Amino acid sequence: SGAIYVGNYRVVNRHLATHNDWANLVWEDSSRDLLVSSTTAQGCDTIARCDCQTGVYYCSSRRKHYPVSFSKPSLIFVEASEYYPARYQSHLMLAVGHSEPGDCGGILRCQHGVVGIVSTGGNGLVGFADVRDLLWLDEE
């Protein structure tokens, strides 16, 4: 589990969104595994605006933050889980890093701020849904 809290937005994995998220919906995209809902309080996270390929992510199944190198956001074939059929995920970055299902929502961050959240992994893979292209998270 986990979310990004930027401005009056809450960014979560679409597959982990609650009824309150869906009832206060701003934007969602199944191909990216992302959903954004509105919040009453302002958040403290800042979004990175960059092309970094190194950063640090939080792994709840280890209670640890790990430094990683990660690929650029791409369209990458993702095998079945309980939430989607084997399908093509978009805006996804991969790293070698330990991963299990409930890890989704952990933040990946670089020197500029929040890069994305955990979404996929296995087999020593961890996939991050990128948020750096969502420039509107910084306004309104």
Ligand X SMILES: COCC(=O)Nc1c(Cl)cc(C)cc1OCc1ncccn1
Residue numbers annotated as active site: 15, 33, 104
Cβ 128 to Zn ion, closest distance in Å? 13
Residue 52 assigned ligand-binding role: yes
Q: For Zn ion, which is the closer residue by CB, 17 or 110?
A: 110
CB 114 within 8 A of CB 10: no
Residue 110 assigned ligand-binding role: yes
Interaction pattern, residues 87-116, with Zn ion; x per rule: CB under 5 A:
-----------------------x-x----
Residue 112 assigned ligand-binding role: yes
Binds 103, which of ligand X, Zn ion, none (CB < 5 to 8 A, cut-off by type)? ligand X
Residue 50 assigned ligand-binding role: yes
Of 10, 3, 130, which is closest to residue 60 (Cα–Cα)? 3
Q: Which residues bind ligand X (CB under 6 A)?
A: 78-79, 81-82, 99-101, 103-104, 118, 120-122
Q: For ligand X, which is the closer residue by CB, 26 or 56?
A: 56
Of 59, 66, 64, 49, which is closest to residue 133 (Cα–Cα)? 49
Q: For ligand X, which is the closer residue by CB, 24 or 90?
A: 90
Question: DSSP assignment of 72-138, as one string?
Answer: PSEEEEE---SSS-SEEEEEEEEEE----GGGTTPEEEETTEEEEEEEEEETTEEEEEE-TT-GGGG
CA triple 82-84-90, angle to 5 deg? 140
Cβ 123 to ligand X, closest distance in Å? 8
CB 11 within 8 A of CB 36: yes
Query: Which residues inside 37-66 make contact with Zn ion, applying CB under 5 A?
Result: 48, 50, 52
